[PDB]
Design a protein around this ligand. Structure first.
Ligand code: HEC
Ligand code: HEC
Ligand SMILES: [Zn+2]
Lengths: 136, 136
């Protein structure tokens, strides 16, 4: 019933990025520069196919530093992970939700079975609970 | 002696990202959110090896829109490309420098055989003319 740490996710396909700055409603706790990654199974779902069990999406969140009209990546704050298992994660729409503090496998963050994560993602039911869109 | 368009670069390894905001010395024409990509050959150099012939680094530059203090990726502005060939690009330290307007193969931006690009990158001679560092 646990989401696997997504070993090697830094080698995966870069889906998209966004910056959430102070003053944005999601400033706590999603503030910073985030990169979304997708393994091969997740790419099948993102392209408009279906998500196979074993699809993984990673939200990779960096702190940033203000450097002379540049925002520069600082320390990693955390990763968010969605792992596809239609049966095992059926309580949260077939995705298991987990967070890892500083992206460390030993700092698991989710305490409520991912119901809190799923509460927000449920708005995206029509895109299989995934916000991110594939871009060129 | 033209740099090849780096077909499939969006499937390559994501090295790092940075935001260049208005007022930055490099705003014209590098302003926006950029993502650095490396093919397998360029990863050998970024890890501390010699960059092999065929190494390619891509600077993928997106415009952004600030919306409620989120910076949201907009349209691709351009890609910058560095292609390693010690012999064919000897005049610019063994890297060929090109830009592609909107990331399109038909929109070549470099008009001076890459001397201006090389002029700034020459400061990084000790790291084989590459600014970006591998991060985990
Ligand atoms: C809104 C109130 C949210 C809560 C709570 C959670 N997430 Fe979420 N997530 C949200 C948005 C708006 C986005 C898109 C970001 C973008 O750049 O467009 C995301 C994205 C993810 C991703 C990437 C896949 C996707 O759906 O786009 C993952 C892997 C992810 N989120 C995981 C996650 C976890 C583990 C959370 C709770 C423990 C969680 N999210 C809460 C909005 C919201
Ligand atoms: C300084 C005055 C610059 C000029 C002119 C050019 N580039 Fe450059 N480039 C510069 C910096 C500071 C960086 C690093 C950005 C980061 O996020 O740290 C870069 C990066 C690139 C990359 C990525 C590889 C790397 O060296 O880090 C490429 C592929 C690249 N630049 C290409 C490029 C081309 C094609 C240019 C002119 C035609 C060019 N650059 C000019 C600084 C400067
Ligand atoms: Zn200033």
């Amino acid at each position: 019933t646990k989401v696997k740490y997504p070993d090697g996710f830094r080698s995966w396909y870069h889906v998209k990025s966004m910056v959430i700055q102070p003053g944005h409603p999601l400033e706590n706790p999603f503030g910073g520069i985030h990169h979304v990654y997708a393994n091969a199974e997740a790419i099948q779902g993102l392209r408009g196919g279906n998500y196979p069990d074993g699809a993984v999406l990673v939200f990779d969140l960096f702190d940033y530093q203000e450097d002379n009209h540049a925002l520069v990546e600082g320390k990693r704050k955390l990763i968010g992970v969605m792992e596809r298992d239609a049966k095992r994660f059926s309580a949260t729409g077939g995705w298991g939700y987990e967070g890892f503090g500083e992206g460390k496998p030993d700092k698991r963050l989710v305490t409520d079975g991912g119901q809190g994560c799923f509460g927000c993602h449920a708005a995206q039911k029509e895109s299989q609970y995934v916000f991110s869109r594939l871009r060129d």
